Amino acid sequence: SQDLSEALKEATKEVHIRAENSEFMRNFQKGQVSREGFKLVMASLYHIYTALEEEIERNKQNPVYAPLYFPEELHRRAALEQDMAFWYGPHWQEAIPYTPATQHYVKRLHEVGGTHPELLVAHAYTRYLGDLSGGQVLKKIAQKAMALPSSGEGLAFFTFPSIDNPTKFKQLYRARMNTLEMTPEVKHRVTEEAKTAFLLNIELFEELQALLPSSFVEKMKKTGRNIIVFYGSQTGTAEEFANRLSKDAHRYGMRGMSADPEEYDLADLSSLPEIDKSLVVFCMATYGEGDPTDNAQDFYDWLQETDVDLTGVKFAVFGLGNKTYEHFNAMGKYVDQRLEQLGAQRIFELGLGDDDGNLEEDFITWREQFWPAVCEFFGVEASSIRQYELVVHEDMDVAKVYTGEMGRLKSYENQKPPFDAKNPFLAAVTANRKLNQGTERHLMHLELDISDSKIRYESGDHVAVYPANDSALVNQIGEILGADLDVIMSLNNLDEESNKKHPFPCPTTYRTALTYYLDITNPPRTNVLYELAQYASEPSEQEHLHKMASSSGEGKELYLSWVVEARRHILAILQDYPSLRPPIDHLCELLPRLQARYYSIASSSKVHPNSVHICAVAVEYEAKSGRVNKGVATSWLRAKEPARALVPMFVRKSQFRLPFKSTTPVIMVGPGTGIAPFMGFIQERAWLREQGKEVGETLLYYGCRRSDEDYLYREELARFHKDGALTQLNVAFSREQAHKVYVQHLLKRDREHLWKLIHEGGAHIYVCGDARNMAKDVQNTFYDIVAEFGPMEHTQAVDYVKKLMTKGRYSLDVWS
Numbered sequence: 001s002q003d004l005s006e007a008l009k010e011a012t013k014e015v016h017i018r019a020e021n022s023e024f025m026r027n028f029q030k031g032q033v034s035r036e037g038f039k040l041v042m043a044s045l046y047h048i049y050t051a052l053e054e055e056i057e058r059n060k061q062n063p064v065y066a067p068l069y070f071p072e073e074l075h076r077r078a079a080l081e082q083d084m085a086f087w088y089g090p091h092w093q094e095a096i097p098y099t100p101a102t103q104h105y106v107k108r109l110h111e112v113g114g115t116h117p118e119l120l121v122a123h124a125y126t127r128y129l130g131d132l133s134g135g136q137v138l139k140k141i142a143q144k145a146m147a148l149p150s151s152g153e154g155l156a157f158f159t160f161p162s163i164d165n166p167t168k169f170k171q172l173y174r175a176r177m178n179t180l181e182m183t184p185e186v187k188h189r190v191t192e193e194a195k196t197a198f199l200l201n202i203e204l205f206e207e208l209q210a211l212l213p214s215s216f217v218e219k220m221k222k223t224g225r226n227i228i229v230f231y232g233s234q235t236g237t238a239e240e241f242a243n244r245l246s247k248d249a250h251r252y253g254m255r256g257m258s259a260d261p262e263e264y265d266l267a268d269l270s271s272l273p274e275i276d277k278s279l280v281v282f283c284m285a286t287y288g289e290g291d292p293t294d295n296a297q298d299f300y301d302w303l304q305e306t307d308v309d310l311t312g313v314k315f316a317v318f319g320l321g322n323k324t325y326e327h328f329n330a331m332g333k334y335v336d337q338r339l340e341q342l343g344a345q346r347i348f349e350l351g352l353g354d355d356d357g358n359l360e361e362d363f364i365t366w367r368e369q370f371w372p373a374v375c376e377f378f379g380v381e382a383s384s385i386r387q388y389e390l391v392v393h394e395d396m397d398v399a400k401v402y403t404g405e406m407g408r409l410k411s412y413e414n415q416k417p418p419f420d421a422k423n424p425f426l427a428a429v430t431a432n433r434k435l436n437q438g439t440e441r442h443l444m445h446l447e448l449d450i451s452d453s454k455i456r457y458e459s460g461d462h463v464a465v466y467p468a469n470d471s472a473l474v475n476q477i478g479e480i481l482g483a484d485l486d487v488i489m490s491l492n493n494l495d496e497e498s499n500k501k502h503p504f505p506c507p508t509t510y511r512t513a514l515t516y517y518l519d520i521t522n523p524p525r526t527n528v529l530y531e532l533a534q535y536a537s538e539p540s541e542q543e544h545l546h547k548m549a550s551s552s553g554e555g556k557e558l559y560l561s562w563v564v565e566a567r568r569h570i571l572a573i574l575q576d577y578p579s580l581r582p583p584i585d586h587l588c589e590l591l592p593r594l595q596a597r598y599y600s601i602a603s604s605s606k607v608h609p610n611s612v613h614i615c616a617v618a619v620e621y622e623a624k625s626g627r628v629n630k631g632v633a634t635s636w637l638r639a640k641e642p643a644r645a646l647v648p649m650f651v652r653k654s655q656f657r658l659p660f661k662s663t664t665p666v667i668m669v670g671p672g673t674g675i676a677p678f679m680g681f682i683q684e685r686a687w688l689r690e691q692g693k694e695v696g697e698t699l700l701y702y703g704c705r706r707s708d709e710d711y712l713y714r715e716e717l718a719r720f721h722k723d724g725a726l727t728q729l730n731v732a733f734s735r736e737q738a739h740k741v742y743v744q745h746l747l748k749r750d751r752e753h754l755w756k757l758i759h760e761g762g763a764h765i766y767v768c769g770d771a772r773n774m775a776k777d778v779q780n781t782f783y784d785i786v787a788e789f790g791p792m793e794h795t796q797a798v799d800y801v802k803k804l805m806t807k808g809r810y811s812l813d814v815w816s
């Protein structure tokens with residue numbers, strides 16, 4: 001094609017199929033990889049990436065490669081050195097081999113980097129994009145094939161800690177490649193060089209291959225079990241979840257085991273009701289086009305054409321899936337509905353794990369709410385189960401106690417670089433002023449001083465902040481609970497084979513854990529209610545806490561209506577249920593951890609290198625329980641005054657980026673707080689105009705209610721517009737007349753100019769904000785613009801916009 005990304009993909013179409021169909025790669029996909037061949041390919045990759053990044057640094061400022069210089073995100077030589085130290089011992093330097101094909105690849109890399117840098121892209125692509133695609137799965141295979149530690153040792157080459165979203169980063173990289181200005185003959189040479197790189201990898205793989213040459217029901221009956229957890233897994237994730245679920249069966253009064261439905265025939269499940277209250281749980285991963293895992297095939301087919309009655313069987317299903325597949329969790333949903341229709345009764349709602357989001361936390365949530373449901377559906381053991389042991393340190397020096405820090409002891413005081421999620425930097429609150437002009441809601445512009453923190457950031461990157469719950473809430477909880485909050489204590493995990501030895505940094509006081517470590521504002525989960533049920537003296541409240549710990553009957557309805565809809569925090573529950581008198585150590589054991597909150601950076605580092613600007617709306621509402629609830633992070637930051645008030649924060653890289661060429665036009669859409677990152681963009685753009693660089697058009701599409709209410713940055717945006725930095729300033733006011741006006745209408749208004757920019761000027765579209773379904777609205781608006789002004793059918797216009805998305809030109813930064 002015309003654009004470099006599409007042209008390279010079309011050129012490598014065939015050699016990619018040939019590469020992934022190489023004998024070694026096919027054996028890798030099936031999981032049949034050996035440690036020796038893996039060491040061989042890893043050493044070869046060490047040599048190859050060393051040569052490649054050597055030439056990259058040699059040409060990191062040559063215009064034929066400069067847009068592709070992402071050392072902090074893509075480079076692999078350090079991770080490959082770590083993996084060589086792992087796989088080849090401490091003296092890996094002299095032990096790793098250097099195969100002839102590896103030498104040929106390195107020689108071609110050096111030839112390119114030395115006398116033909118315009119072709120270097122073709123190699124980088126061939127490697128780096130490839131590492132961001134299949135590489136995410138291969139690791140999950142190796143972790144099981146070679147059995148490596150879960151810490152990722154030996155697989156650091158497959159880990160990109162600075163790439164939060166690999167798909168969006170591949171979009172950005174495609175955009176940077178399309179930035180490369182080149183003659184068509186140079187483009188053809190580049191495609192041929194990408195073919196050459198693929199062929200080098202293919203023959204490397206070829207050479208490396210040349211250097212290699214009973215009834216389960218009656219068994220539970222004969223072993224005394226009542227819980228069995230079948231798993232349908234291919235890369236071990238469902239195995240992990242099923243084994244972790246079986247381990248906790250012995251820790252609730254029952255006992256359970258895992259099971260592979262590839263060695264049993266599940267027709268035996270017909271004779272399962274003959275066990276004194278038993279449960280059958282499935283952890284089913286889905287693959288292909290909604291097809292089951294291989295081991296579950298015999299299961300799946302058996303589910304198809306059968307109707308053997310299994311009345312009395314109690315079951316529960318959890319599905320491992322991924323939202324980006326248009327067959328989401330087909331296997332889990334199928335097993336769930338088929339088991340229901342066959343005559344079994346369900347105990348807990350089917351879980352739908354999302355690999356696109358967070359599968360581990362999803363499974364943790366599902367299990368946390370799952371166990372109390374089974375408990376209160378089968379009866380009770382007086383809730384006689386614990387997880388942490390309390391140890392009170394009545395005499396202890398203060399330099400040994402955690403006072404609120406997140407990483408190492410006293411890390412908040414001896415602040416030493418680097419700073420990240422585990423060691424946040426305590427930024428100084430420079431400014432904290434009100435952006436909102438009215439009185440409906442509070443919107444604030446904070447400035448964090450990170451002067452000597454050595455922290456870098458770009459416009460569009462995010463800043464996360466560790467807040468602290470309101471101290472009045474902590475004091476009230478301590479009073480009503482009748483417990484001393486200044487008691488230095490610790491909670492030690494008695495499950496030895498777990499690195500997680502504490503529910504939060506210990507030793508520390510109950511007050512510190514309630515202020516900085518525990519979320520005491522979000523609605524309580526089912527598990528904490530079922531565990532507090534044993535501390536309710538009145539039966540009219542103990543039975544209420546018991547019923548609110550199940551998925552069936554009036555229980556789930558009452559839980560959703562009284563705790564979820566009303567949004568009652570733990571203090572409100574202790575108030576409305578005066579019988580609850582639990583110990584504070586158990587409450588600390590049960591309460592979830594206080595999470596950090598992210599915000600879009602509202603400043604360009606090119607004009608504010610030692611400060612990070614945040615634009616945030618304060619969360620504060622009247623809950624249906626009468627009580628007024630305050631957002632943790634927003635109120636916490638609002639309380640920060642320049643009279644030194646520190647904020648523990650860190651910076652997470654995002655793929656939201658301005659175009660590399662200053663001449664490229666931008667179309668930013670951000671109603672409300674979604675203006676935050678663009679406030680940075682414009683600044684940088686303005687700065688680029690001050691440096692004498694030719695800057696293209698810059699269009700902003702902001703949206704608010706009334707011009708006198710919540711017009712954010714009105715004066716700054718006006719100054720930007722009159723200085724010429726901001727080309728157009730189109731604001732939609734949703735409450736300034738009869739019919740409301742949104743930014744989609746303003747886009748539809750400027751359809752002709754927008755199309756001319758997109759088609760003739762190669763513009764970049766940006767969308768940001770927490771506005772409801774705003775994404776699809778702007779998306780359909782651009783669909784219609786492209787369909788009309790580019791003589792296109794609707795289908796080809798939607799494909800045009802999705803292509804823009806692929807080329808890294810239609811970017812999103814939405815939240816909720």
Ligand SMILES: Cc1cc2nc3c(=O)[nH]c(=O)nc-3n(C[C@H](O)[C@H](O)[C@H](O)COP(=O)(O)OP(=O)(O)OC[C@H]3O[C@@H](n4cnc5c(N)ncnc54)[C@H](O)[C@@H]3O)c2cc1C
Nearest residue numbers: 597598599600615616617619621631632633634673676815
């Ligand atoms: C990448 C990313 C970027 C972000 N950028 C920004 C930004 O630039 N500016 C900004 O302000 N926020 C931004 N956010 C959101 C931010 O992280 C927080 O979610 C938000 O600021 C609230 O934080 P909080 O701790 O004060 O509220 P929390 O203590 O976390 O409570 C929030 C909960 O309160 C509930 N709630 C809120 N209002 C009501 C209501 N009327 N009635 C009933 N329930 C209600 C909701 O269920 C909500 O989930 C971003 C989030 C992400 C993931």
Ligand code: HEM
Nearest residue numbers: 005008009016019020025029125126127129130133134201
């Ligand atoms: C295990 C074998 C392999 C598998 C399963 C595999 C799988 C994939 C998949 C699924 C994609 C699409 C990702 C996307 O565009 O969203 C992809 C693209 C790609 N793969 Fe492969 N791949 C394999 C081998 C290789 C090898 C050996 C290389 C080169 C060293 C490579 C280079 C690429 C590149 C560069 C892309 C990006 C193409 C583009 O979008 O322009 N792949 N691969």
Ligand SMILES: Cc1cc2nc3c(=O)[nH]c(=O)nc-3n(C[C@H](O)[C@H](O)[C@H](O)COP(=O)(O)O)c2cc1C
Nearest residue numbers: 233234235237238285286287288290321322325329
């Ligand atoms: C080839 C392949 C196909 C997949 N297809 C789907 C799918 O169709 N629907 C879905 O929800 N998830 C799909 N996934 C996501 C997996 O279900 C998800 O990664 C799951 O956690 C894997 O479980 P396991 O590692 O235990 O085998 C697919 C994954 C792969 C590698």
